[PDB]
């Protein structure tokens, strides 16, 4: 065994090894291993992406106009965000400016995704880490109603409703076919909600499962379908016609009315169901404001998103702020430049890829994706891994760093950056949330805080949906209908050689696509995705990524039952297909 | 009465097919899971992880040997001895073969499981391979699309439960009910195609009147699916209705049939 | 002034004359006049239909296969029922038998209409006679929640919800733009609900206004659209294809899944919102179990409906019983024959029509529709009716009688017929309902009883939707897909001369269409519609119809404010376009 | 902020147009009434009756003279001195003229108000006459159909509220947005029409595949409406999708253009 120090942690791989493979209630394929000491405290953590497809390779030689459709299929959970980054990158390369309505519609598509993705994550992915579903069978329906009504104005709170939900669960488990609940961690000492809060949360899980299907109708209006809506380089394909013949063949007043209806319903659900449930989880699990801090009190990163001024990606335009903090210096939010070769770099010394020099990082315009499955001296064999060897290569995920620093990305990171840049709405929102919990601001830098920030962002995005919708309607009232710029649609109009960067904030964090075009074809296409940051393996200096850091020092009540590991990993909302692409 | 056991596994994928399933409007996915089937294994949704999840897998495929339906999303890679997709420290293909052996029938959800989809597009770095090229001794129902329509997925499930049989299929293993006709055989812009009324550039006057997308690369003429009839997201739209040509996403090899913007 | 005796009533047109024109919250155009005595009790009542279109005349010369489409436009509230009666009449004339799935789908269409029509009547038409909407502004939201939760398991009951509803109403009223609530009867002493019940009822009014749009999606699936779905002679046009190529072009599993979803939601809404609300109206308005009896303790009529055996309209087939009671003799339910010239006859001595002899009644196969506007002396002019002359002609509605008897039709009539034929489900439901209200059975024969019966029927129909759906699915599982018979589609196959009767129970009561075909065209088409019975004018013997009888003997608190008149008339659910056609 | 006053009157009618209006899915009719307009007079929905109702009518048309929108459902009959439709003891045509005189603009809902509809079909016993033949000095927007599509009704209302203007209209006064193209120009069965693939008798093999309804009398080729694109009842269906040809119900005189089952 070995021990070394990095980032304030003592990484020690002596002692008992625990393996969690598969990690469930994530998107895609992940393995996690830890070592625990005699005190059941994690002293080493290992993050492994267990899938790879090779989109960066597949994109070579394709028409740049097609790229969005391929990269959209990086992920069906964060569906659309890779298309958006792609069109941004190709437009940056070629020098295309889109019309204002296309920008506004793209912002609507992104905000819709934030709302949908965050909602489903909270309930379907992370929820059962916090809510003991079987304990809901012991609740009193009247006390459940009283609790729900004390937390929210949401209408669906009658004792009869909660009794009906409880009886549905009773029937479900009566035949002994427990389905997704089978062999869960129910009764674990870290489940702290009272029975009535478990029943409330389970009711809401079911309400969210039904409701989420509505949100994405906005994607269907503008983008044809969800999952995986359609886009174009130059704008959007959803031509608008409000008051002319043939409006039945376009985005018309009836289609816009549908969008408005969905926006209102989405805001209402997020504000009155998800927000109070997040706060309730906080109230009953305050010790988790001190667990899973990881890198969130050290190094955080946001590129920024939602340009309000069309084709302007600067600080004055982006509604979701960008910036980086390192060394725990939140007084110094630093600007990020995605073209600077000294800023974003990926390392592969601990990943399954070949570089000419694996001891150095490569900026994505110099990126290389040459897969090399070489797990080395594992316990087991290369097709039957019992334990990965984290001293060697152990993941399909590359290791991104920012100026050589390991960073956390995602809702908590964005919230910290916006708060410390002095965004008024963010400061007010965070302050009021922490005051409601009687927790210090540092309590947000934690597993609990990641969940709280994610719920807050869903509320933020639902509000922004209305803002963007109203901006679109203002344009239409002024006779501004344009949705595509086509003067550089044809390849003969493009530079013979050019390159571009497309960036945004996906639900899970900072996303970038770097593209080079030569002679009308994709010459290079490199993606660095939010879960690539968070789930990163180690670098040549032994620096650990956000997941490995957040797991360090965590106490486990029952080593064989990885509830605490799942809680912290799920708080980051891992998307493994994203991470590996 | 007991519900039919279903085991849902995931290979190389983007999870679009699981996402599509949970969009179902009628029946709601909630009601499919609670009342129609017993969804007994599914990494995306299940409470258990790690050793506890793999105990579920083993217990279900053993207790219900010969009696469960296997749903497959994604596909197995043959490259790197299968270790482009690792499940419990072993190649995914080993899990697929173990799950298939006990299944009464297999549902290949989406273009990934049916044909290969994006990871199988040139140059296919991982040697991603559709399910019917690996499993050759079980009935396989192909339900293609990237992803398939939510209410098509749920209708196929309700068909099977209600009628207690697999749907009738075409020569490619696709359900005739939803895949028997081409997009272009039921497209509401077909009046325009037949009149030579085409969008020639994005957001032109033709586009604003809903003219045909053929000259913009629409692959509807060669694509079998239900999008132009059933539509998407509870009838709200489909690609063409929102102004983009069909990509051909339900067809084998659609990614490598030329640019999406080249005419069929 | 004059007085005479009929049906146990003393009809006396001395005293003050009150006019209500227009009657609102009905379908179509009605005028009512009454006389009141010195104790403000009604001693004379005059029912007048104030519109006529002439569909019976327009239908002459049409192709019988087209007739359903014309007559469907008799009424957009009871939309579909006239189409059903038409296809039945034409099939009866020609000798067409439809396939079982067509009959099942027609029964689904009719049950859907019962659900939809009864729900909208309860809330949007009648509800404001019972709920003082402006008094809802004085309610305590917590007490509203408690009340709602004591009545029902319905989820939507939180204090916050009721506060939000109340605040929406406050904001609506605050600028003086009271809309549909302007100059209402609010504060009338006959409004007996406490403020919390008024707020509950108003909230449910809004929920029903939203929800009703869903119910008719069943008509859209099978019939293309609602209002005014499509039908065919020979079955239905909605071809079924479950498992063959091209199912995308037909009623397929996805379409059937949609129908099932709607059925479930419809039953939930009716059982947990409308039913408890109806019972609550009963509990707080018990004196109305003794008001508005009218003909309901004397003479009631049903033709019956919902044939369960395809093409069999006999007693063993009809799920909704037919029969007639006269002279208060409920121990002898009499059979009805729509071909018998001595049974149904229409009189026009008090209506605006010409017969060769207006002192005799005409069976509909001998019917005549020759309009003759002739109001006589009306204290104004022919274009300014100040006071109808009820000694002479006073309505566009013909006067139907059964064996010379004036009859009540509709939900209360049907309930009484079924009860006294010994329908087990009806006996049990009625007895349990009257017990729960602590009222005698005779309390059902009243204005309150009409309302309670209608709500019961909505519940019955919602249950029958599932029964019919299940029957359809059974046929499909057995490989029986047929939806149309076309053996006699072509006119060359028809008899040169034939006649037929189509009958059913519309939401408002007994409906018949009598059709005679000659040489491939309609020679005669006569309709007798439920509101024609109930809103009937007088006959040559001076016998009064159901509305006039029910208004007789009623006390008015405030003569100038006709709330009691509105309550009783609305309890019959008047459809004036139906009545006059 | 005050909402625009609306007066809704009813002539000879079946009430299908009111019923359609309340079916609106987006915006809900509830939200139209509570938030977008002030529906200040409407016999079918209002609390007041008789003299109380007529006091509302008179007050609104006087207070808001020149500023209210008049919605008209149904039509006036000229026969029997107008007394085939009696309103407060007088001919409906008098109420129509009084309401029209103060309106800023008029919405003629449905085929009744637009054209005449069923009561105007041969031999037109009451001399039912559309609004534009009686009211000749006000802007009239025709919104035909029997009834018009619910979400078309509400879209026209939201257009006028949002944009503060009347929709642009064709030569007949119909909004271009929804009435500019034929049913047949946007029909999903057009591929079958173009291929000579027709239903020949009900429930034949062609009908079960969704073939074209032209030989069954479909009037889509001569009918202007939005049914084949926007569809009915929140996108659920339209006549043709459920297997019946278009009757032509948005067109002037459709009842008298031959049998519904005779070919165009
Ligand atoms: S838009 Fe595509 S599918 Fe539709 S008619 Fe044109 S080419 Fe065919
Ligand atoms: S069904 Fe009617 S509208 Fe559609 S293509 Fe055929 S004729 Fe035209
Ligand atoms: Fe649908 S998992 Fe998403 S990529 Fe195309 S189907 Fe695969
Ligand atoms: Fe629509 S009221 Fe019904 S008949 Fe044709 S529109 Fe008129
Ligand atoms: S791209 Fe796919 S979703 Fe349908 S319209 Fe074409 S098959
Ligand atoms: S009958 Fe009418 S509803 Fe549409 S499809 Fe034809 S215009
Ligand atoms: Cl799996
Ligand atoms: Cl493929
Ligand atoms: Cl869908
Ligand atoms: Cl009126
Ligand atoms: Cl007409
Ligand atoms: Cl609609
Ligand atoms: Mg990459
Ligand atoms: Mg008649």
Q: How would you sum up this structure, described in words?
A:
The PDB classes it as oxidoreductase. Keywords: NiFe hydrogenase, Iron sulphur cluster, periplasm, hydrogen, oxidoreductase. The assembly is tetrameric. The entry is titled "Structure of fully reduced Hydrogenase (Hyd-1)". The complex is a heterotetramer, with two copies of chain A (581 residues) and two copies of chain B (264 residues). Chain A has a single domain (1-581), classed as Cytochrome-c3 Hydrogenase, chain B. A three-stranded antiparallel beta sheet of chain A has the order 3-4-5. In chain A, strands 14-15-16 form a three-stranded antiparallel beta sheet. Chain A has a two-stranded antiparallel sheet with strand order 1-2. With 581 residues, chain A is an alpha+beta fold. Chain A contains 16 helices and 16 strands. Chain B has nine helices and seven strands. Chain B is α/β, with parallel strands linked by helices. In chain B, the strands form two sheets. A five-stranded parallel beta sheet of chain B has the order 2-1-3-6-7. In chain B, strands 4-5 form a two-stranded antiparallel sheet. In chain B, helix 1 (16-22) crosses helix 6 (150-163). Chain B has helices at residues 16-22, 29-36, 50-63, 92-102, 110-114, 150-163, 176-179, 190-195, 205-208, and strands at 4-10, 37-42, 68-73, 86-87, 90-91, 103-109, 140-143. Chains in contact: A-B, A-C, A-D, B-C, B-D, C-D. Chains A and B meet through helix 1, helix 7, helix 8 and strand 12 of A and helix 1, helix 2, strand 2, helix 3 and strand 4 of B. The structure holds iron/sulfur cluster (SF4) (2 copies), FE4-S3 cluster (2 copies), FE3-S4 cluster (2 copies), chloride ion (CL) (6 copies) and magnesium ion (MG) (2 copies). One chloride ion binds next to loops of chain D.
Net shape of chain A? globular
- The CATH topology of chain A turns out to be Cytochrome-c3 Hydrogenase, chain B
Residue fraction in strands of chain A? 5-15%
Termini gap of chain A = 33 Å
Category by helix and strand content of chain A: alpha+beta
Sheet with most strands: strand arrangement of chain A: 3-4-5
Kindly provide the radius of gyration of chain A, computed on alpha-carbon positions and rounded to a whole number of angstroms.
24 Å
**Biggest sheet character of chain A:** 3 strands, antiparallel
* CATH class identity of the largest domain in chain B: Alpha Beta
- The number of E-state strands of chain A comes to 16
The distinct bound ligands, ions and cofactors come out as: iron/sulfur cluster, FE4-S3 cluster, FE3-S4 cluster, chloride ion, magnesium ion
User: Could you state the CATH homologous superfamily of chain A?
Assistant: Cytochrome-c3 Hydrogenase, chain B
Tally of separate helices of chain A: 16
What is the CATH topology classification name of the largest domain in chain B? Rossmann fold
The second-level CATH architecture of the largest domain in chain B is 3-Layer(aba) Sandwich
The first-to-last residue Cα distance of chain B is 51 Å
Q: Count the DSSP helices of chain B.
A: 9
Any guess at the CATH architecture of chain A? Answer: Orthogonal Bundle
Helix content of chain A: 25-40%
Largest sheet of chain B: 5 strands, parallel
